[PDB]
Every structure is written in structure tokens, then in C-alpha cells.
């Protein structure tokens, strides 16, 4: 499906947001908000600040 990789190390400052390491890439990352994303990091889903993350193509 979809995928993404964190540009830097970020801390999800949200109730429905998860954190992940830069090199730590995740899968199943869809784009709901033009500024925010959502994907599965190590099994669990969450939200990603597009600012510290980038999908893959």
C-alpha cells in the first residue's frame, strides 16, 4: 500500500499521534490531512506530522 520515512526524530504530541525514529521507516501510511498523515508504525497506527515525515513512491 503506502509507506513513509521520518526525516528526523519526532515526538507525537497528540492523543492520536505516534512517534518514530528518522531511519525507522513505517508502512501503510495514508494522507488524510494536507498537513497531517496516518500510518502503521511497527504494527500500530497513528498520525504523522508531514513536517517530520515523507511518504515513499
Amino acid at each position: 500500500g503506502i509507506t513513509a520515512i521520518a526525516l528526523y526524530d519526532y515526538q507525537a504530541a497528540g492523543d492520536d499521534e505516534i512517534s518514530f525514529d528518522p531511519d525507522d521507516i513505517i508502512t501503510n501510511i495514508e494522507m488524510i490531512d494536507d498537513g497531517w498523515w496516518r500510518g502503521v508504525c511497527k504494527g500500530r497506527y497513528g498520525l504523522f506530522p508531514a513536517n517530520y515525515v515523507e511518504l515513499r513512491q
Partner: peptide
């Protein structure tokens, strides 16, 4: 070898109320 500073935070996403 890449160097980049952290970007600003985006506005919280919109979410409708629960059913």
C-alpha cells in the same frame, strides 16, 4: 551525508464527533 533542521508544526487535523 545530509544535514537538515526540524520543521514547524502543522495545524491539527479535523475530526467529526463519534457516532
Amino acid at each position: 551525508t545530509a544535514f537538515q533542521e526540524p520543521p514547524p508544526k502543522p495545524s491539527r487535523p479535523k475530526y467529526r464527533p463519534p457516532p
